[PDB]
Amino acid sequence: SYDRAITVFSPDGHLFQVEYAQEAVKKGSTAVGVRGRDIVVLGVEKKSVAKLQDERTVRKICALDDNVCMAFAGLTADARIVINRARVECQSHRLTVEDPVTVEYITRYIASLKQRYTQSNGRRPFGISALIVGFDFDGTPRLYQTDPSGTYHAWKANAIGRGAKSVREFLEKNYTDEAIETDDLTIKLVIKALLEVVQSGGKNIELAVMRRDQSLKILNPEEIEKYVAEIE
Amino acid sequence: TQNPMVTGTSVLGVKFEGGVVIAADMLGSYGSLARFRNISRIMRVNNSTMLGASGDYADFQYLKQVLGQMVIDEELLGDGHSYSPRAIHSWLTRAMYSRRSKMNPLWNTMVIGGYADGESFLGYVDMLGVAYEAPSLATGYGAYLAQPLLREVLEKQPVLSQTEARDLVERCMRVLYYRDARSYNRFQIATVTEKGVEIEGPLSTETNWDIA
Amino acid sequence: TTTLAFKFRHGVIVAADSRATAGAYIASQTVKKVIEINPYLLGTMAGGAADCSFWERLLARQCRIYELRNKERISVAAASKLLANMVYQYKGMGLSMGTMICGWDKRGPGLYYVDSEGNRISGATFSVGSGSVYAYGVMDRGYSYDLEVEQAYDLARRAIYQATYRDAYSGGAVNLYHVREDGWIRVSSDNVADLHEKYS
Amino acid sequence: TTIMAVQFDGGVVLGADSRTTTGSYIANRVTDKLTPIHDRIFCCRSGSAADTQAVADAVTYQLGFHSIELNEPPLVHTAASLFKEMCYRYREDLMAGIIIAGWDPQEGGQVYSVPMGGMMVRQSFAIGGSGSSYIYGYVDATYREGMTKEECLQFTANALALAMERDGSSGGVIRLAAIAESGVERQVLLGDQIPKFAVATL
Amino acid sequence: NQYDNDVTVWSPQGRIHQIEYAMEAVKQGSATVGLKSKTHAVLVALKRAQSELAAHQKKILHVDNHIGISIAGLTADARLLCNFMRQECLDSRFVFDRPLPVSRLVSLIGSKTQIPTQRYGRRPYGVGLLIAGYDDMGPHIFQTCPSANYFDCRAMSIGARSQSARTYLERHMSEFMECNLNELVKHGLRALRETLPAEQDLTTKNVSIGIVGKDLEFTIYDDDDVSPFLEGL
Amino acid sequence: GYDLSASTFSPDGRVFQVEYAMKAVENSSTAIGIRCKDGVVFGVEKLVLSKLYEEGSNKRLFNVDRHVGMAVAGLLADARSLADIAREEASNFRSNFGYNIPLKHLADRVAMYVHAYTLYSAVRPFGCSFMLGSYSVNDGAQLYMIDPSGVSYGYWGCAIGKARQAAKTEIEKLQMKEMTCRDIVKEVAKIIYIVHDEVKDKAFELELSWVGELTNGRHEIVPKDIREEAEKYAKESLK
Amino acid sequence: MEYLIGIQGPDYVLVASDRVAASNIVQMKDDHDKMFKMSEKILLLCVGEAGDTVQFAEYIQKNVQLYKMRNGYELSPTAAANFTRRNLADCLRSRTPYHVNLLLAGYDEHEGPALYYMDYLAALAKAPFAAHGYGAFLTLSILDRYYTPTISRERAVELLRKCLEELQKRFILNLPTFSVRIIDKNGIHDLDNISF
Amino acid sequence: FSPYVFNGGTILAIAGEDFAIVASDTRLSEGFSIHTRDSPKCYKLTDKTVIGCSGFHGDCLTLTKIIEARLKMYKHSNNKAMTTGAIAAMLSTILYSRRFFPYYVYNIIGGLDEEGKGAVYSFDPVGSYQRDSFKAGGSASAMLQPLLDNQVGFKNMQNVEHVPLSLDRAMRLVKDVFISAAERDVYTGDALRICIVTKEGIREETVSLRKD
Amino acid sequence: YRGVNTFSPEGRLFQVEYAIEAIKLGSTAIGIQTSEGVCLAVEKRITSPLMEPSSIEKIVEIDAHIGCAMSGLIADAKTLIDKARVETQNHWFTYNETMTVESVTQAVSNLALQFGEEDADPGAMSRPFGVALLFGGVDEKGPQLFHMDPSGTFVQCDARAIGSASEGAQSSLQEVYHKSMTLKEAIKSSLIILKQVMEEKLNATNIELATVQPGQNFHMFTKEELEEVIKDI
Ligand SMILES: CC(C)C[C@@H](C=O)NC(=O)[C@H](CC(C)C)NC(=O)[C@H](CC(C)C)NC(=O)OCc1ccccc1
Ligand SMILES: CC(C)C[C@@H](C=O)NC(=O)[C@H](CC(C)C)NC(=O)[C@H](CC(C)C)NC(=O)OCc1ccccc1
């Protein structure tokens, strides 16, 4: 059993393996999430359709449960492993607690899993950051972010991946109660933020919408184009 | 041992002024058969401790090997510390209880006599971990036959001399030979005093009246 | 023994006797058969005294950890499920444990019956113990969801008292509890001898 | 089954019957119950054939390796100790009664008894098996100190013949073996060679 | 600079540098003294605080009714060793109903501490100990090192600036055997005082005393409990 | 970097880690052991590092078995670990076979245990040399020595430590094959004093042990009276 | 003993079960639910030893839901039935067998309605109709007499009533209320309880 | 092979305003025989706590040793002595740890609580425990309890003042209940050992009973 | 190269030294002990306005009478806190009492430094925890404040500051703190220092304050209480 200490401290108190995992998250495609009054929206920029790939099998937005979904930015294979671990935990929580999971609970579970891989023996840190959105049983919308280090926070709106600094800067200035006043207005805010980085727009961005009672919904290309047209 | 095979009968013990004396016959009965008639059931644990045992003889031999090995190890250090009779009695109680708990008991009833720090010790240990210290002990059928005589004398006279204790033991050994169907006429007497442990040869209950 | 609990308009009422027997010998007449798991959760004990006390205490520790981790009080359904899973690992190994978990959760008042045999159900009224059959008759005839608080106390006391009268292994004092939206309260502890004078 | 071993000045004499039974059927009537563990060390087997054979093979392997390592001939006491160690540890699984006899330079002829249970004891002479119960008085009455090899051979032959006559699980032929510094001399008494005692007729 | 990175690597001079560094850890620790007489064994330690508002770190720990230790080095390792010693003392009492002899307890420590110093990926225990106990053979004072070696002493000092203390103990070693308990403790305190850096005095806040005797179970004196001993020096 | 592990041969076929272990053994104080007709005698030059140490502290003579002795040199911690191993081997032998372990067999078992630590990088070679001595009527006096590499041989007189060469020269003139333990004890004390360097080391205490017919085959410390006589004889010899 | 019954029609599956939770000659619950929602088109009816039924059914439910969440589509009724049999059979010879009798009902878009029968030995059978418990002895003949492959759901409910009336008239246990449910292309529909 | 055997013994505990009494007989027996006449069932745990164990002597010794070890472990870790309540809670967990191989022991803890008042805790073999004002356990538990309930508890008596229980009255009551029990119970009646826990310390008294 | 269990020439473990260095990257946290109670304060250090400050939990409750303040790699402290909570409930379950603050700190400190690479466990910790913890609570001894470092060393302290501004926060605590200080004065003093060291302007949303008192349980100040205190401060 390989049991070498992959992650160790360094002079000045740094975990280079954690920092490298972060620079691996930064190379990934951009992802955006905003928390609306009665809606939570997740957006992501597609590097290239390629006109040959089957778009069904390259989704970067996944549903952990009926009331929770997440989008990642980093290594695709690592995300698939983390997503599966969350999915089994969500079902396990349903089995024991007899109630649907809360966004904070599953975020805490995922973060703890990531932290464990940074302190375990013979293991590499997970090279992904995740944006988890959903609705608690009380109905309050939630939006969380998790880093490879194992830390997590609750965000009104945040972006991860390539060019996340600019998108976050744009969101900070453009996020207000008026902007999230209506569900359509909230969607436009995500699209405009993504357009800050991605070039083509419409054909290079994927959007997912989650409402209080309704399940996860993926906007069709026609809907995305219409919103882009309304934006311009 | 789930079922004993070759067993020794009662063992006696009584403490006097300045020592302890233990008796036991040299006979291993294979279920109503005097099979082995020259086996000593008394062991010299160390310079101030001696041990007699009843029940399965093979289990007694195992304890002889283990206990003898520990004494050797302690003497190797040569640090001035040696196991006292109380320490050996405590160790045996734990060993017997642990085997009973695991459901693989050592089918024995042991009597431990010793003399250290100018004080006599006499202890008892059953196969189930029962242990205690009394002025006189008698395992097996000795509890029914020999114990009443020893207790009666000791209640009358709490402290005995070496000669009185030896004569008392011989009388009890005679009674056991009369009425115990698994007893033998040849037996050993072990004594521990300030001068160490001495084991007496194959004595015989010569005084056996048979006026029928 | 006789434990009893039912739900009504103003919460859930829990009552029990205070007798413990060892064979045909009355070991004690002051046993506390209701466990204060939390200021909002209660548990009753019936069956093995050691089994019930140990596993309820284990449940109380698990519930407290749950609250610390999740920063929210555990629900009645979750607590009963926790106990059901803990004791199911030892099914068929001789544990005797019949419990009712009573509390007020976010969904409202809750009452679950958990047995060492593996049963876990919720209902309006329950009764566990040797005298449960006797307490069922009195409770069934006098129970109504629209009972007043004072009436509910009287019905619980009468049901336990009648059970102690007919059951050899039930007796002592009737301990009464009432779980409300803001927590449970120790209503009273009336001796069966005194109740016998009152009812006759 | 009847196994007998005697000790004389400078060696030991071993003997056994040659009957193996499965109920009342004699599966083998010429079985050899004297297993040579080493040179000048023998063991007489009684009880379960499977257990005794397995135990004898294991001790033979252990003693042979031990002797090679030490570059000295094995001691009879050591061979008995190895039998005791295994028979005692697996006392609940093994049904095997053994007597170990042989010669070594240090102590000369020795006879050790390892009955069921795993106890070990040095004996001037030993007997075992189902048929041993019928000759306890005979060996006790007719045994003497200082017997020679020839006397020991005759003493063992007479005892075994009586046991085979009475016991139903004993019979066939008598296999003997005298062990001394010179070597091992084995012989088989069969037919009229077996000692005979007239049966009273009224 | 390639022979001082593992404990399983001998150097050309036949030295294991890792063990040498562990010995250097106890030197950075704080001073502590231990001496014995015909009847008593005494431990006196000098506690120091990281900050003025922080309590002085404790240096004397209980092991059994007749054994105590004074630590100097990595505290986490000290607790691991103290825990091991307590279990060994408990096991002896449980099995033999008898106090574990001090020398046999020290031998167990050496055996345990030696294993890390010979396996890849393990490290020596970065802590030195001054074991004071009483057994059937009389008072005992022992010294342990990160290297799994121990010495039966009559008076020893370990820790920072402990050579000045050892100098005092050797000078007055001839008097310890026949002095009373009060006199013996004062000898331990005077040595510890020598270790102190000139402009500083022994205080009830930084001095801790441990005493074990023929008819005196191991006791620890700290805070105002030390005032009776300091009064007179 | 060919000398950083015991699992690598040097270009010329040498395990430097083992060689360094022997070098550590060569910095200790000398310890000698002489075999004679009656039995075996051991002697050790115990330096007093500090006057604060109790007499008998850090004893370098051990009783691995009631009939077997043991003298050591080098890292003391490793030596004590080997002594525990030797005791375990001796005890296990008695339980399995029922009699005292022959000294030759005991030396072989301990030597193989030592040798197993010079084959892998996961452990390091014992940095200590030791010698085993015993006496039995059947086997007579026997003396053995084992080095870090795991090699064991029989000796008539052996030395280990700093002044190994000087001690070997002195031992050559004893003619031990026809001498008794009583006379050998005085000779052992004399040699230790001669090899010792008073100029370099401050002071030392002489530790003596023997096993033979006079002790009935049990290894034990030499009596205080005999040790005092031997020390006086050695000091007088050093005119 | 509990009671389960299932009738399969051309394009639907009708299932019913009693609502009694007894404990040593006392009805502790009168509205117990013995049907588990595997998915939007599958129902598991589990009866047997206390604890075993809930533990097994919940365990299967978690896995079936997990499969849906991981693959984006729900398990077919046949696959779910065979998955259940595999788990039951595997535990059969272990130290912790599950003593449960199961009826699995479901609807698949392609295959159509399906009713499956399984006993505690994990023998799986597909039948037009099945029943579990002692009441199965009295009601199975009624189903054989009156069942047809082309039975309308209105007639199926009537046939279910005749089976439940027989239990009231001739069975010894007190089973007043019965849960009723139906599965078709539109999912699981809860019908009115049949009460007496 | 039965791993259990009953050795008799009776224990009793009474709590008072400023004291706690724990008493027991000193007879150890097996079957119809008497092992020793000087085997008290009282065990001192701390300066203000005493435990009385009766039943299978093999489990009695093991449990007492386990408790003695655990107390030292607690003191070392928490730097303070255990309380009577803490000991009672721990003993419940220790007893239940062997639920499926229980200690055939009856325990009664008597001592002072944190407030300085007497406290008595009774136990079952499998850890079920409960605080009480007075309790009797062992062979003669059924004989002792009814009188304690009548006299200490003032049960079934009317128009009687409930005067607080004094130390002298409690001591006389303890002796009387045991004297009566010795007359009817075979397993008890060699001698009476009384342990009195108060603020000053633990005091011990011995009173003779009828030998047979 | 340079295994985790390695000793520097000065006897200081490399990994522990680096872990201690990692503490200086954390936000400042202050804890003051008073006869009336113990108060804990910590700067939240909001990175961006879009982050929800309610989700930064740098003060957590171990039990009703124990509270913990964290600084450093906050993700590491999650396992330490979970161990402390579990240990506290185990003690209540067994002894039916409440663990003391020192005993809880001791259990957590023992968990720290139990890291290894070879022959430790299938998934043992590979590195020390990079978090410094301040344990505050009320026990039989009254209010208690304990500081635990990555090295597994814990000590009681009257007032202790940890984090990026520990040097300078401790300096201020030295001048102001005194034994007879009340709980109100302690809270005011803690806030004044925090406002001084913090780079951002102190307000009711970017700091966390909690207290434990002999009567009340562990209490975390809400915004309304925080606004009241800072107004005077
Ligand atoms: C607290 C309640 C559970 C009290 C009451 C209620 O049923 N318990 C009981 O009546 C049961 C008997 C039976 C009815 C299960 N009694 C008990 O459990 C009593 C309680 C002591 C106070 C004497 N103890 C008892 O029977 O223990 C014997 C025993 C010994 C070893 C293993 C298991 C059980
Ligand atoms: C080979 C001898 C040393 C042992 C021999 C002598 O009595 N033992 C036996 O004959 C005993 C008798 C008794 C256990 C029924 N029989 C046996 O051990 C077995 C029967 C087993 C079911 C136990 N008999 C048997 O089938 O023996 C087959 C056999 C035939 C020839 C040589 C070796 C073995």
Distance B136 CA to ligand 2 centre (A): 49
For residue D52, the ligand 2 atom closest to its alpha carbon is 3
Taking an 8 Å cut-off on Cβ atoms, the answer to whether B6 and D117 are in contact is: yes
β-bridge partners, H49? H46, H111
Q: How does G105-133 read in b/e, with b if 16+ C-beta sit within 10 Å?
A: bbbbeeebbbbbbbebebebeeebbbbbb
Chains touching E, CB cut-off 8 Å, 3+ pairs: B, F, H, I
With a CB-CB cutoff of 8 Å, which residues 56-75 of chain C face chain I? Answer: 57-58, 60-61, 64-65, 68-69
Side chain identity, residue H14: I
As assigned by CATH, the class of the C1-200 domain is alpha beta
Ligand 1 surroundings by CB, under 6 angstroms = C 1, 20-22, 27-28, 31, 33, 45-49, 52, 96, 169; H 102, 124-126, 128
Q: Is E58 on the interface with H (CB under 8 A)?
A: no
* Interface contacts (A, I; CB < 8 Å): 95
Using alpha carbons, list the distances in angstroms from residue G196 to C42, G34, G164: 36, 19, 9
Q: Which of G2, G53, G54, G99 to mutate to test the interface with C (most CBs of C within 10 A)?
A: G54
What spacing in Å lies between the alpha carbon of C48 and ligand 1's midpoint? 5
Contact between C6 and C13 (Cβ < 8 Å):
yes
Using an 8 Å Cβ cutoff, are D162 and D197 in contact? yes
**Strand D3-8's sheet: what is its strand order?**
D125-128, D3-8, D11-16, D174-180, D184-189
Contact E74, E31 (CB under 8 A): no
Minimal CA separation from C71 to chain I, in Å: 10
On whether the CB atoms of residues C99 and C46 are closer than 8 A, the answer is: yes
Q: Residues of C annotated in the binding site, as ranges?
A: 49
CATH topology for B1-212? Glutamine Phosphoribosylpyrophosphate, subunit 1, domain 1 (3.60.20)
* Residues on chain C touching G21 (C-beta within 8 angstroms): 119, 121
Which domain, by its residues, includes A199?
1-232
Total structural domains in chain D?
Answer: 1
Instruction: Examine chains C and E and say if they touch (3+ CB pairs below 8 A).
Output: no
Is C119 within 8 Å of G51 when comparing Cβ atoms?
A: yes
Catalogue all structural domains in chain F, each as residue range(s) with its CATH number: 1-237 (3.60.20.10)
* CA triple E180-E183-E189, angle to 5 deg: 140
Q: Which residues does chain E have within 8 Å of residue I117's beta carbon, measured at their own beta carbons?
A: 121
CATH number at residue A183: 3.60.20.10
Q: Is I78 on the interface with C (CB under 8 A)?
A: no
- Shortest distance between the Cα of G4 and any Cα of chain A, in A, equals 24
Separation between Cα atoms, residue H120 and residue G114, nearest integer Å: 66
Please tell me the distance in Å from H167's CA to the nearest CA on chain B.
32
Nearest residue to B63 (alpha-carbon basis) of B90, B37, B45, B86? B45
Residue of D17, D18, D20, D55 to test ligand 2 pocket, by largest number of atoms within 8 Å of CB: D20
Report the b/e string of D115-134 with b at 16+ CB within 10 A: bbbbbbbbbebbbbbbbbbb
Residue with tokens 């306005």: I49
Subunits in contact with chain H (3 or more CB pairs closer than 8 Å): B, C, E, I
Instruction: Name the closest ligand to CA C168.
Output: 1
| Structural domains of chain E, count | 1
CA–CA distance, H51 with F174 (Å, rounded to integer):
71
Question: What's the CATH code of the domain at D113?
Answer: 3.60.20.10
> What CATH number should be reported for the domain holding residue E169?
3.60.20.10
- Considering every ligand atom, which ligand is closest to the CA of C3? 1
Q: How many CB atoms lie within 10 A of CB G182?
A: 24
Distance from CA of E100 to the nearest CA of B (A): 10
Q: What are chain G's domains? A: 1-196 (3.60.20.10)
The Å distance, Cα G79 to ligand 2 centre, comes to 57
Structural domain total, chain A: 1
Task: Give residue E68's domain range.
Answer: 1-233
- What determination technique applies here? cryo-EM
B153, B171 contact by CB (below 8 A): no
Are residues C120 and G54, on separate chains, in Cβ contact within 8 Å?
yes
Binding residues of C for bortezomib: 49
CB-based contact C77 A99, cutoff 8 Å = yes
For residue A133, which of A158, A112, A99, A114 has the smallest C-alpha distance?
Answer: A158
From CA H118, how far away is CA H170, in angstroms rounded?
Answer: 13
Q: Measured between beta carbons, which residues in chain H are less than 8 angstroms from residue I96?
A: 85-86, 88-89
SS3 at position I224: helix
Which of F129, F134, F157 is CA-nearest to residue F69?
A: F134
DSSP letters of chain F?
--SS-TT---TTS--HHHHHHHHHHTTSPPEEEEE-SSEEEEEEEEE-S-TTBPTTTT--EEEEETTEEEEEEE-HHHHHHHHHHHHHHHHHHHHHHSSPPPHHHHHHHHHHHHHGGGS-TTB----EEEEEEEEETTTEEEEEEE-TT--EEE-SEEEESTTHHHHHHHHTTS-GGG--HHHHHHHHHHHHHHHS-TTTS--EEEEEEEEETTTTT--EEPPHHHHHHHHHHHHHH--
Residue nearest to atom 31 of ligand 2 (CA): D28
Pocket test residue of D2, D18, D19, D21 for ligand 2, highest count of atoms within 8 A of CB: D21
CA distance linking residue A214 with residue C63, whole number of Å? 32
- The letter for the amino acid at D162 is L
Mutate to test the interface with C, among H91, H99, H129, H149 (most CBs of C within 10 A): H99
Long-range contacts of I73-77 (CB under 8 A, 24+ apart): I73/A15, I73/A149, I73/I22, I73/I26, I73/I129, I73/I130, I73/I131, I74/A151, I74/I26, I74/I131, I75/A111, I75/A115, I75/A118, I75/A149, I75/A150, I75/A151, I76/A115, I76/A119, I76/I129, I76/I130, I76/I131, I77/I129, I77/I131, I77/I133
Question: Residue H175: which CATH number?
Answer: 3.60.20.10
CA I160, CA I29: separation in Å to the nearest integer? 8
Residue C101 zone, left/alpha/beta (φ > 0; ψ -120 to 50; rest): beta
Nearest to E223 by CA among E198, E210, E197, E204: E204
How many angstroms separate the CA atoms of E13 and E22, rounded? 18
- Spatial distance between the Cα atoms of C132 and C128, rounded to a whole number of angstroms: 5
Contact C167, C127 (CB under 8 A): no
With both helix axes pointing from N to C terminus, report the angle between I74-95 and C49-70 in degrees, rounded to the nearest 10: 160
Residue with tokens 């010495």: E151
Identify which of I124, I207, I132 has the alpha carbon closest to the alpha carbon of residue I170: I132
D1 catalytic per annotation: yes
Burial class (CB in 10 A: 0-12, 13-18, 19+), D136: middle
Distance CA E51, CA C88 (A): 54
* For A150, nearest residue in chain I (alpha carbons): I75
Q: Residue D20 Cα, ligand 2 centroid: separation in angstroms?
A: 5
Q: Which residues on chain E are in Cβ contact (under 8 Å) with F123? A: 8, 118-120
- Across the strands, what pairs with D13? D6, D178
Contact F98 D66 (CB under 8 A): no
The DSSP line for F185-222 is: HHHHHHHHHHHS-TTTS--EEEEEEEEETTTTT--EEP
